[PDB]
Paper text:
The ligand binding site of Nsp15 with TAS‐103 is found on the catalytic domain but opposite to the active site, in a cavity that is formed next to the α6 and α9 helices. Next to the TAS‐103 molecule, we observed extra electron density corresponding to at least two additional TAS‐103 molecules, separated by about 3.7 Å, appearing to interact with each other via π‐π stacking. For the TAS‐103 structure, the structural differences with other Nsp15 structures are negligible even at the region where the ligand is bound. TAS‐103 binds to Nsp15 via van der Waals and hydrophobic interactions with residues of helices α6 and α9 and the loop upstream of α6. This area is located at the core of the C‐terminal domain and shapes the entrance of the 10–15 Å wide channel on the two sides of the Nsp15 hexamer. Due to the loss of activity in l‐cysteine buffer conditions, a non‐specific protein inhibition, for example, by the generation of reactive oxygen species, cannot be fully excluded for this ligand.
Despite the rapid development of antiviral vaccines and some approved treatments such as remdesivir and paxlovid, effective antiviral pharmacological treatments for COVID‐19 patients remain limited. Structurally, SARS‐CoV‐2 Nsp15 forms a double‐ring‐shaped hexamer that consists of a dimer of trimers. All Nsp15 subunits in the hexamer can be occupied simultaneously by substrate molecules, whereas disruption of the hexamer significantly reduces the enzymatic activity (Deng & Baker, 2018; Kim et al., 2020). The catalytic triad, found in a positively charged groove, is formed by a lysine (Lys290) and two histidine (His235 and His250) residues (Kim et al., 2020).
Numbering used by the authors:
A (entry chain A), D (entry chain A), E (entry chain A): 0 to 346
B (entry chain B), C (entry chain B): 0 to 344
Amino acid sequence: HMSLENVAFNVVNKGHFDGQQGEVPVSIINNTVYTKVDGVDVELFENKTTLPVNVAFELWAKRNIKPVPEVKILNNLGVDIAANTVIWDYKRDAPAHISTIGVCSMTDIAKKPTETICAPLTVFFDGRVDGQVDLFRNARNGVLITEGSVKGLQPSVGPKQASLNGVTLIGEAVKTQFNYYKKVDGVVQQLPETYFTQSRNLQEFKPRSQMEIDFLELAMDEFIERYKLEGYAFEHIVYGDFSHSQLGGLHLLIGLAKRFKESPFELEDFIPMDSTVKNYFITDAQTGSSKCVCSVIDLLLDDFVEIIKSQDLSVVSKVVKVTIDYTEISFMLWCKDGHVETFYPKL
Amino acid sequence: HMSLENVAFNVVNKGHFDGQQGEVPVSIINNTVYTKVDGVDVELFENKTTLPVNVAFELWAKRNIKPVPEVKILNNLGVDIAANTVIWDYKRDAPAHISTIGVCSMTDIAKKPTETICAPLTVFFDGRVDGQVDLFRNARNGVLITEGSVKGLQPSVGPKQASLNGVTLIGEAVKTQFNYYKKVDGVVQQLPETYFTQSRNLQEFKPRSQMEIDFLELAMDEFIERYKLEGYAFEHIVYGDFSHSQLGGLHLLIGLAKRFKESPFELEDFIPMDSTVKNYFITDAQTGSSKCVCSVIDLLLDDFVEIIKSQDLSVVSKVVKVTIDYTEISFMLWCKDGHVETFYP
Amino acid sequence: HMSLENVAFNVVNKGHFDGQQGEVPVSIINNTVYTKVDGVDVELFENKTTLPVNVAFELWAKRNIKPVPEVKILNNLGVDIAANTVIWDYKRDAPAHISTIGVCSMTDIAKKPTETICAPLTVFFDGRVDGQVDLFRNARNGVLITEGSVKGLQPSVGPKQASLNGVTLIGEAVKTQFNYYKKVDGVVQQLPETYFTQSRNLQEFKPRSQMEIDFLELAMDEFIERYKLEGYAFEHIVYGDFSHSQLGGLHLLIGLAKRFKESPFELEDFIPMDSTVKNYFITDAQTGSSKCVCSVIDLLLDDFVEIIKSQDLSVVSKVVKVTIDYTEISFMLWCKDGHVETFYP
Amino acid sequence: HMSLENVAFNVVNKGHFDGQQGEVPVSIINNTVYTKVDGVDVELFENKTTLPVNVAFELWAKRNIKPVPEVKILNNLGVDIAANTVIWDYKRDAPAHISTIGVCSMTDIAKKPTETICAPLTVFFDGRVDGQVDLFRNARNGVLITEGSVKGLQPSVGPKQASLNGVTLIGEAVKTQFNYYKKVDGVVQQLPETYFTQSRNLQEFKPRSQMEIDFLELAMDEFIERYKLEGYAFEHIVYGDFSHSQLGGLHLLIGLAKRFKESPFELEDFIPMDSTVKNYFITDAQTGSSKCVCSVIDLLLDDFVEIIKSQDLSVVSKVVKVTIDYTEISFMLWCKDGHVETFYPKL
Amino acid sequence: HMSLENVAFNVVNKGHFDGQQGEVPVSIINNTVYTKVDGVDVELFENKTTLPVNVAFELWAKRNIKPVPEVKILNNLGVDIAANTVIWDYKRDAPAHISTIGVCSMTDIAKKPTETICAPLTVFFDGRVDGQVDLFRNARNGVLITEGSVKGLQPSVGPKQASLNGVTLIGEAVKTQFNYYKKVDGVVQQLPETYFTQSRNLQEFKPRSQMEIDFLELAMDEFIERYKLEGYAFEHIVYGDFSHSQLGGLHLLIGLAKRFKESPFELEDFIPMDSTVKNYFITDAQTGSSKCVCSVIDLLLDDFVEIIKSQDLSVVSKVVKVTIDYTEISFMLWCKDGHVETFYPKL
Ligand SMILES: CN(C)CCNc1nc2cc(O)ccc2c2c1C(=O)c1ccccc1-2
Ligand SMILES: CN(C)CCNc1nc2cc(O)ccc2c2c1C(=O)c1ccccc1-2
Ligand SMILES: CN(C)CCNc1nc2cc(O)ccc2c2c1C(=O)c1ccccc1-2
Ligand SMILES: CN(C)CCNc1nc2cc(O)ccc2c2c1C(=O)c1ccccc1-2
Ligand SMILES: CN(C)CCNc1nc2cc(O)ccc2c2c1C(=O)c1ccccc1-2
């Protein structure tokens, strides 16, 4: 007996859908779900999705509450749909996938991922759930995560971090680093060598290497000296140039983090979604320096240094391709007289 | 297991809530309830009430589908709430009463009408349902209908007509004339002698007496002659005067019906609810004669004639009170030289 | 003390805003205004405009309830705004003009039409209201209607019909034919000689000449013979050709009216507004003949005949300009071998 | 002349409804009330209630702007409705009570609390308003607060704190500790002995005893030693256990406060209302330890210690009842071998 | 080819409308504009205006992204409309002006400011845009800003600060101090001598003089001694009196800033718009002292001192007028025995 009232009962009593029997009184108004508690209405859910309020509510209640891959990873791997779960996208406050399998009568295209309607879709399978490894083996198109070895399959080791209830973290009490596998048209793929973004935020940025600690602590000139980064235009690319009306560079999150601690600025996230590369409209409050489209990526600084030090610097401009989060990211490299002028990603 | 999806299953399979088990998929968008049929969304309900969409839906699904009193009667008798049913008001496309008893978890103030929260409210009880006569006897404030006698309780014979799924009718396959009873502060009240309005509509108006047939068929002068209605200003009150920019008279539905057949006009129902007396903004399409507030009542013409012929006509202006549909309706009577000038509710 | 609650009190008690003091309880939900009557919510107004619900409500309550020019006339004369009234557009269920003068604190650009903000706008003035003729004289841009002469001002006699509470009519109890005047940049303009459209509707179409009676009663061939309309392609233009997948002709309302009586069809009014020329998507239910854009005008047939009989027919194709409802309507005239092929607005 | 426009005039000119004459222009759209200022629309109110926008607006404008009991107290005492005021619930952004008396034509069931429609309802009366003590004496069902003695009536001394415009505070410039009285079916009640919750928040938590200061300053083991709390499982119940995927314990706000200062975590308030016991879905960002339903109460630590030290510890599991904020709160006590395993409230 | 989809393409690709050709898929729901990215809907804009969602979206996309005068300045100067730009009001999240010129087919009253429909309106002209100085010269009613001299016209030097993408700042990489000019009925006006508000915020308040540094650092009594402010009731007006239920004084932002650092309080901005004088409902969390209408202005403290020291103190009460931000602000001055009692602005 699946129902709006039963979903609400679960949310009230268990914090999420947990398959318990029961009903509470519910009111729907203003894209909002309320329940009655002691004669008054209490908000349980505000719909921010493009689905009907009651459907969005159910999908949210049925969200995966274990560590799951960040949505940017799933997107980059071509995932269309999940087997028997909902990946909730906390960046969009909406389901990561528009359809479901065995979750919700209004969004389900199928009850089981083996139905032929699923064949053309890349289905996400979670090896931590009994039976899902086998379903991946039978699926035409799919992506699988596991915590350990799968007999016969070569793994790709994924990022250290995963999302738990919208908190991106590196697990200590729980495992967040998965093995990844992928199948296309019934054939297992070799996933490419890749860097991974670090998924940090501007304000509570934690360094993850000695070089990052050095970057944060040292002044610009000493850092560049120590790591012998002369000619790589770090002053521009990483630290940023706030001297002109158009803000120069500032393409690495760690650089934004450093600046923010010194002097606050505004970041407009004008396409608010999870992605490997983010585009921001930045206004520096101290100087008035601004830029409409500032491309930003959170690479470990050491990774960024490896990338820029692995390029030929003998041409004015060219596109540099880098596998990051399993996708091909295009960077523009501008050089002059054998040194870098700038280097930035394209979204 | 009451639920949105179960209510929808009942509506889809049984046409209304009928206590069947089952669920269908539902989508709610704005004020509309949809169900999925073969991959597409089909509208089941558009909310026109001031309640939440899913609540209004349930109340509508649980509406009484037997003949029930017209809402104007219930309102006139001071009914606040119904015991274990929903009276759906088809004039408002909304519940007649905002709260319920034993119907819906979101609107219920009680599960049974004996709870002390119900004591100050006038609860409607339906004697056709087992147990409800006894509940009326124990209730402090209430209105009861029955199809037959209740031992010891003095009845008031109600209107001939009732509402069945929003159709007002005089039943042949079903009974629509009830006995009425009322209690206030624990004490049974004597309901007053009353006329009843006829609940007809302008376009499909059916006469219900020889006098009404005569009114519709005969020209003004011969009708007035035959029923000896000289000096009662029927030409004004009933037929209406369309000769000036302000429309004169036209206070009886039958008069509106006659004119409508001859020449169409616009009626704006600017307070769209069920009531004994209705107010309309009328514009006559043929002449341009109009009036912002035209008070209209559907009395049997014979009843209207009895009322107006039972007045003293020796005073310029006077308020005349008449019990109709159990309520006191005030009429203004204007006279001059021993004849009526006008008479309107 | 202007207020939502006071507007509602007026609507409830007087049918429209009438400047009475008082308040009733009001609820606003989405785009609907409700008032509380005996414990329940009754709808007073559903907002179909692009204004805020409470503002649209007030403008509607303050609508002009006298005969006023049809909106198509006001639009054709370039009217931007009204002085101290609201012209309600019943075709759009919205105000004819987005701003007001001396009506409503939320929409007013001025309290009096003499304020300099009004100077660039063509302000509508109603000579039936004290002071408005004088305001027109002082206004830089304006349109004036009156029921009689204004000393020194050369009149244009307007259409016979006007709109009274959304009913287009030729007044008998009230005057609906106005004199018109217009000023541009401080200078009175000579309004052109014009035909007027008749503002009839498909279903309740009434002929207004012997020729129109003949058209409706006679078969095609005898009508054309009697009025000697050979070579003017009336069979195409007026009667319509339903023989092919694309519907031919059918550009006069009277022709639509005749066919509708014989055999129903669908008309999609895909730009639902008042205008001199209307465009419809027509599907003929009997034959399946259809046309996405069928241009239709309601001219008195006699006027249409005068127009088409006053053309030179020696050129293949030509634009014919005709003043109708004070605006220049372009017609395409297609000829071949000295006869008309088609003629449409 | 009560009206939408008059309410708006009061809000604009006086900050709340204050009975002044006047009108401003108002627009209603999008569950929002706007007023026109110099040719442009300014938002005055966004409706988050289940009432009509214009009605919610009026009730909010007519909210009590003196210190008033927290809603959890009023709820716990069975209050249904207030006499001649509106208690605004700032946790729900809505009226605490669905009906009114002498406030608003759309919500009023009565103009005076003596009308017989009020008899079955528990009416809240404020002794600081002239006449209300007498109205309580005549009422069948009611709750009364005063600042001082009422002849003949034994008081219950309420919490130190009250709510002033949604700020919970202990008054210095104003009195916030009331005497409470209650009547049921025309009979004055003896209110029970009760603990009170402290109504603090996680981030700006202020200790209110030496023991709380000690808890915040000292490390776990020294605190437990000093207050001789061995065997009471404080390490679990108060400090929390973040070592496993399921977060253990953490049922006292002060424990949450301590952890939060050390290491931030996410709290989902999935039933956002005022209540003595709160249920949160917690995700610890550092470890990945989480729990869907973590029951949390803000008792003075000394009170909590008194409660746990006043229990028999000789049974595996049982329900412990405690009067808090005038209501009976059920706790589960789990023991083993004469020591506590865990102890937590139920909502 | 102007269109919803083209506006969205510009927002996605350029961060704002920049005249680029292209279209993306768009969904409109819930006063919200979404675009489709890789099979899912991403929010681009939430309409908080009283305009249609798609129109508000376009105006926002076409907002001026250079430093522009704060809206309070434009309002104070009587500006009705802007020539060929949109001034976005970030305080209201809406256009500063209801109509446009040469911006948007749905809001335009004209394509060029020379059309006669514009004659009665005060049109804002930006001298940094080619041709606009000349348009001001031909306009009947207008306000002009420039960065430098205009031949023949005497300038008024405006505030140091301007708004850049909703960030009020004093430019270093960009110019934010403009020359102002104004025309009424075809005649150039002499703008009055004026003080300017400083446009700071409570939490990140930066002093801009030695006196302000002293105010923030020194205790009350020493500050008053040093600047010889005895008898001017600074203890009341600037510092505030929290000793009674009604909060006394506290009319200068710097005073609020000082208090806030010591002890947080609640400020309800009940008319949320840009204005020279702001009215707040204040509740002090520490004491419970409150006031429904607390008028607050951010004057440089030195300016405030000059103003109060330039008044006659020999009458009980009177209105003091002060030109601030080009408008006449009325203050009430209350005196007794030759000293100030209080002094506060009226909104
Ligand atoms: C264990 N280490 C490898 C990294 C620990 N270092 C830091 N952790 C932080 C954690 C935070 O939540 C915020 C700032 C932090 C900072 C460091 C630094 O080394 C550092 C240097 C300069 C500014 C901030 C931090
Ligand atoms: C049993 N009789 C007393 C009523 C039968 N007479 C009529 N029935 C009608 C039923 C309809 O559905 C519509 C019009 C009706 C009319 C009569 C009339 O006698 C009469 C006279 C003039 C106009 C209409 C009707
Ligand atoms: C005063 N006369 C010029 C007009 C009277 N003639 C008609 N009046 C009608 C009034 C209606 O409400 C509906 C149809 C009508 C028709 C006529 C006709 O002559 C005629 C011919 C063919 C069809 C309908 C009508
Ligand atoms: C007057 N005393 C009884 C209590 C004063 N002590 C504290 N007040 C605080 C007020 C705040 O707004 C935030 C943290 C506070 C803290 C104390 C502590 O003693 C303490 C110890 C460890 C961390 C925070 C605080
Ligand atoms: C360059 N000087 C003229 C001003 C620099 N002084 C300050 N800047 C601040 C910038 C901030 O973002 C926040 C607080 C600040 C404070 C000062 C002070 O002098 C001061 C004194 C007491 C409290 C805060 C500040």
